Design a protein around this ligand. Structure first.
Ligand SMILES: *[C@@H]1O[C@H](CO)[C@@H](O[C@@H]2O[C@H](CO)[C@@H](O[C@@H]3O[C@H](CO)[C@@H](O)[C@H](O)[C@@H]3O)[C@H](O)[C@H]2NC(C)=O)[C@H](O)[C@H]1NC(C)=O
Ligand SMILES: *[C@@H]1O[C@H](CO)[C@@H](O)[C@H](O)[C@H]1NC(C)=O
Ligand SMILES: *[C@@H]1O[C@H](CO)[C@@H](O)[C@H](O)[C@H]1NC(C)=O
Ligand SMILES: CC(=O)OCC[N+](C)(C)C
Ligand code: NA
Lengths: 334, 218, 218, 224, 157
């Protein structure tokens, strides 16, 4: 199942059976020969082709021998490899279910000359080689008739819908869990102290890792603009907020390294970020009386930077939790 | 959406005179293939539009040679060598370059002629209006030109603006003059209270407004 | 080639109407269908387009959400559905065939008229009028015929077997509050009006109403 | 104009056995049929006209050509390429607001340069540039890469200026009168000057990076 | 079939990035040792140059009849940057010496604090400590190598 190119490759046996009125005999006249195998290229055959072919062959090409019975019954079960186009929907990738179809019908004979009968509505899976990547939920053929502007008659067809469910363990382990582990680190920058000299390293690493994983997802899914994978939306939103965190981190580092020799602290800054916000954030500054003015204002700038970090530590945690639940919870409920 | 503006809003030009309609785009509407897709449509009254020009200059099949187009990135113009009776209508410029594709504002085309003074008239209600329980006062102005017409509903020294209907007629063919029928709906409880009804209309030909009135008291 | 539109519609405010455009004589699925709105006042406003072969659709910003296009390939018909009809939606709607960058709108639908109103079918109330008694009689005088309180359009006014066709000036219908009206005045010799009989006929096919009220001197 | 581009792909049909004196090719319709079309989901069909072509100079040449005018649906690449590119580009100005004492300027500017280079190569793999036309997104990425390289050079110079002391350098008087007095006024800084030489160098470095922060915001804004 | 390549694509995708990375090869010698980011810069330059060499290797045929000139330049720059990394390690080691852990030989004084600064137009302020002398010697060493690399790199063009 090529999701990027939106093609399904299948190996099927095309079971066909019709009646030939000139290929009848009496077994009593031929030593009780009841049936024979003949090259299928020596007899008339229906011209069933796959309408939605893509990168393959329209008709059967192997041309195995046909089984002919004394009453005129012809059985022909050739093998075929079909590459058919189907629209891929990866909204819930890697927990996605795909619905790929195959439309079969005679190309040049209309319903009054050749009509199709469903041998069995369900596709046969008695000799199915299990893939390990997809499971067939349902494979049923539907008989349809329709008129084409080419021709005045009605051309029947049988369309098979292959409802296939992806087994998500492989992509879970290889994409989802690494992405979640990186997502766990998005808010950590706001708890790193400004003196460690490693805030930028962490936030930049998170941003670049998320970008790389988004690029990896892009190489898997089709480049269609009708649906957006949930994983892609989550990664994009996380990247946006990580970029915002980098901007805030640059600002906070700038605030931390301010001193009286270069900056002046406004009275309103002092009031707000040394009295009001610390109280609302449940952080209590020790009551310390430093005598050196230059060393005390430097410590006030360092404390103002801590408060700004704590504010955004709270907001990003709330957004991270609300956003994740607001994105994935509803789909998991039906 | 690219905005397309047409000038003039109305283009009076007598028979046989050169006509010039201009269209401008809010953005360049050129395309890569060497063409910019601008088309001119003409609609006669009570009819569906009709194609005249496409791709700025290329002329549609079956249209008179008199029509021609020209322009550049954001300025285009239509030209009519000679005007005729069939030529009367509204002309629109259509841009087919940037999605969504938009129409021009429309440039009505008229034929100018010797202006004629309006023939104002006033008709009081009839007996049927009295029986039904209403009073309809209507003012007529026929065979006047140009659109420089204003009508004022002055009644016994009072100017009333409420309940005034504006309904004029498009330029005709035999006379090529307009008309303007203004009505004032009065109730019986109020119709008889007032005494004098007048219809003041002013036109370019006669600077002094023309006066036509009748008195209820008789 | 021919685009056949559905018939005229009258709808109540807040309802939704669906008009259809049927194209024959060409590959219906390979030409875009353009929908154009023409308010009775003035102007052509493109609503949007749909390519029947695919589901592709575009809308102008003014109509995003107001209109929705659907197409049936089996029957060569395209549909436009208008939702939440207000009084502004009353207009004549056109469907046109278009191929971007190659063929302009060379074929148009006849036009479908949509009227949004709360009224119901009402016969006309023709009230013929004559010149006021307090009015000087001169060589040339104007006659009076009034039709009001009718709905919906149209109403044809003519003289007795076209007795006096030329020289008549009918006017477009207008709404006083909810119903339509109409006025019609003609010029006749002062020596022929009292001697000869002049009358205005009224026909209202919507209400299947025909009236004939002669006007006599006051 | 990728991903807001419109493609004009043609399909020429001829007989590679017979010429115009033997078979004449005629169009049954002026457009290709879409009666049994399955929409793409990535490409939008605009127009499929057909034309019959002859050669006034050859007289043995006849062909029928269909023009496939298709329009890309840009949401996918918008979301997956343009937004990440804009996010990375927005970081190209931050190095000039990062204080020197933090000791992290090089990391930031180098990381931005790495990300931009990777994106340029990926874009080239998707839509290859050619002499006829270079994608505008690729042009912008290259211009931003040049700017980020210039910013790395400027950051190195600013860091050199920041770590200067009287024990190793002497401040020329013109450096004083310019960077400590005049340029700050133009940039609305107003050195507090409440009261040493080491702090003077620290202010000169801070003045230099502020000047470039203005330009990069200006140029990046002009990059719109 | 004498054919000529249209070089715009590979210009944009290989040449401009390569020259941009090469222009940073000498910056490490102008970066003060106190910033604590010399290793980051020089190592990043080395790894970027190596990556671009590997990309070129993946593009061209794996034949040994000739070497592309661009590959030759990338290899030369890679050797130069490795030399710069070793020199930066030595300069950092010299910078962080102190009177408690190291003693400065008199020849080190006469050379690095007196003669070489005059040759390089450095002009030690000498307003007046021993730890500052080590920090100055490191400044002189990497200023000397800045001159060498510029000449060896300017002749690279
Ligand atoms: C898509 O590409 C095709 C092929 O390049 C374009 O077709 C070319 O279009 C031009 C412009 O219409 C044609 O030239 C014009 O031809 C007419 C009629 O012969 C002539 O009167 C004009 O003076 C001009 O010469 C050109 O012949 C035509 N070429 C071919 C091979 O068909 C097409 O316009 C492009 N469409 C879009 C939407 O990009
Ligand atoms: C003919 O062969 C069939 C098996 O193919 C067997 O069942 C049947 O009895 C045979 N009849 C005779 C007459 O030999
Ligand atoms: C799959 O697609 C076919 C044809 O479009 C439709 O009949 C069927 O209901 C679909 N089934 C599911 C599970 O989507
Ligand atoms: C008659 C003929 O060749 O028809 C081919 C097309 N089809 C399968 C849609 C009818
Ligand atoms: Na890295």
């Amino acid at each position: 199942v090529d999701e990027k190119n939106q093609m399904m490759t299948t190996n099927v046996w095309v079971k066909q059976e019709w009646h030939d009125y000139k290929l009848r005999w009496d077994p009593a006249d031929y030593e009780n020969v009841t049936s024979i195998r003949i090259p299928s290229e020596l007899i008339w055959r229906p011209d069933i082709v796959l309408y939605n072919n893509a990168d393959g062959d329209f008709a059967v090409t192997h041309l195995t021998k046909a089984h002919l019975f004394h009453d005129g019954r012809v059985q022909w079960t050739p093998p075929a490899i079909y590459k058919s186009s189907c629209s891929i929907d990866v909204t819930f990738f890697p927990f996605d279910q795909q619905n790929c179809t195959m439309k079969f019908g005679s190309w040049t004979y209309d319903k009054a000359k050749i009509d199709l009968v469903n041998m069995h509505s369900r596709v046969d899976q008695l000799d199915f080689w299990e893939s390990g990547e997809w499971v067939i939920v349902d494979a049923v053929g539907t008989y349809n008739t329709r008129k084409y502007e080419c021709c005045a008659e009605i051309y029947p067809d049988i369309t098979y819908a292959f409802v296939i469910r992806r087994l998500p363990l492989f992509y879970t382990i290889n994409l989802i869990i690494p992405c979640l582990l990186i997502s766990c680190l998005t808010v950590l920058v706001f708890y790193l102290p400004s003196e460690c000299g490693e805030k930028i390293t962490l936030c930049i690493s998170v941003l670049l890792s998320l970008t790389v994983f988004l690029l990896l997802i892009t190489e898997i899914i089709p480049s269609t603009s009708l649906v957006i994978p949930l994983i892609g939306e989550y990664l994009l939103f996380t990247m946006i907020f990580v970029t915002l965190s980098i901007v805030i981190t640059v600002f906070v580092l700038n605030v931390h390294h301010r001193s009286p020799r270069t900056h002046t602290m406004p009275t309103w800054v002092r009031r707000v970020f040394l009295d009001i916000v610390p109280r609302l954030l449940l952080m209590k500054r020790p009551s310390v009386v430093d005598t050196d003015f230059e060393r005390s204002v430097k410590e006030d700038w360092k404390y103002v930077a801590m408060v700004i970090d704590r504010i955004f530590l709270w907001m990003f945690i709330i957004v991270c939790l609300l956003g994740t639940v607001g994105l994935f919870l509803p789909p998991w409920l039906a | 959406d690219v905005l397309m503006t047409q000038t003039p809003l109305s283009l009076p030009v007598s028979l046989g005179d050169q006509a010039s309609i201009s269209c401008r785009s809010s953005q360049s509407i050129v395309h890569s293939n060497g063409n910019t897709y601008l088309e001119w449509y003409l609609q006669k009254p009570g009819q569906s539009p009709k194609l005249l020009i496409y791709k700025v200059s290329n002329r549609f099949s079956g249209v008179p040679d008199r029509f021609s187009g020209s322009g550049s990135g954001t300025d285009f113009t239509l030209k009519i060598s000679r005007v005729e009776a069939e030529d009367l209508g509204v002309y629109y410029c259509f841009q087919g370059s940037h999605v969504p594709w938009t129409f021009g504002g429309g440039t009505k085309l008229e034929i100018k002629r010797a202006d004629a003074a309006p023939t104002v008239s006033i008709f009081p209600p009839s007996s049927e209006q009295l029986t039904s329980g209403g009073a309809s006062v209507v003012c007529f102005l026929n065979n006047f030109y140009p659109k420089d017409i204003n009508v004022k509903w002055k009644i016994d020294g009072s100017e009333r603006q409420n309940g005034v209907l504006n309904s004029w007629t498009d330029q005709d063919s035999k006379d090529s003059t307009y008309s303007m029928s203004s009505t004032l709906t009065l109730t019986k409880d109020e119709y008889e209270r007032h005494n004098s009804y007048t219809c003041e209309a002013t036109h370019k030909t006669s600077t002094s407004p023309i006066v036509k009135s009748f008195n209820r008291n008789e | 080639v021919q685009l056949q539109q559905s018939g005229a519609e009258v709808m109540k405010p807040g309802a939704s109407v669906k008009i259809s455009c049927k194209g024959t004589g060409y590959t219906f699925s390979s030409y875009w269908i353009e929908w154009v709105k023409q308010r009775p006042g003035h102007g052509l406003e493109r609503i949007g387009e749909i390519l029947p072969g695919s589901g592709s659709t575009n809308y102008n910003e003014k109509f995003r959400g107001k209109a929705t296009f659907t197409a049936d390939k089996s029957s060569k018909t395209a549909y436009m559905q208008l939702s939440s009809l207000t009084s502004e939606d009353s207009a004549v709607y056109y469907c046109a065939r278009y191929l971007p960058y190659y063929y302009a709108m060379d074929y148009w639908g006849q036009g479908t008229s949509v009227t949004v109103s709360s009224a119901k079918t009402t016969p006309p109330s023709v009230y013929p009028l004559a010149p006021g008694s307090a009015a000087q009689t001169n060589s040339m005088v104007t006659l009076g015929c009034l039709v009001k309180g009718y709905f919906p359009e149209p109403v044809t006014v003519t003289w007795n077997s076209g007795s006096l066709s030329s020289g008549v000036h009918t006017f477009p219908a207008v709404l006083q509050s909810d119903l339509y009206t109409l006025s019609s005045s003609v010029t006749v010799p002062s020596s022929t009006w009292p001697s000869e009989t002049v009358t205005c006929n009224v026909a209202h096919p919507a209400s299947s109403t025909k009236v004939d009220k002669k006007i006599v001197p006051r | 104009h990728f991903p807001f581009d419109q493609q004009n792909c043609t399909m020429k049909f001829r007989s590679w056995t017979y010429d115009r004196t033997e078979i004449d090719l005629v169009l049954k319709s002026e457009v290709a049929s879409l009666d049994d079309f399955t929409p793409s989901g990535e490409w939008d069909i605009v127009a499929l006209p057909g034309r019959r072509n002859e050669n006034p100079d050859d007289s043995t040449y006849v062909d029928i050509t269909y023009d496939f005018i298709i329009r890309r649906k840009p949401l996918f690449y918008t979301i997956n390429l343009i937004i990440p590119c804009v996010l990375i580009t927005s970081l190209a100005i931050l190095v000039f607001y990062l204080p020197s004492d933090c000791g992290e300027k090089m990391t930031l500017c180098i990381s931005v340069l790495l990300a931009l280079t990777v994106f340029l190569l990926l874009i080239s793999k998707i839509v290859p540039p050619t002499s006829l036309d270079v994608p505008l997104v690729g042009k912008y990425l290259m211009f931003t890469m040049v700017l980020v390289t210039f910013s790395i050079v400027t950051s190195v110079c600013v860091l050199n200026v920041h770590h200067r002391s009287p024990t190793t350098h002497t401040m020329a008087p013109w450096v004083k009168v310019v960077f400590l007095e005049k340029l700050p006024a133009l940039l609305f800084m107003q050195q507090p000057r409440h009261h040493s030489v080491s702090e003077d160098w620290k202010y000169v470095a801070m003045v230099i990076d502020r000047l470039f922060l203005w330009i990069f915001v200006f140029v990046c804004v002009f990059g719109t």
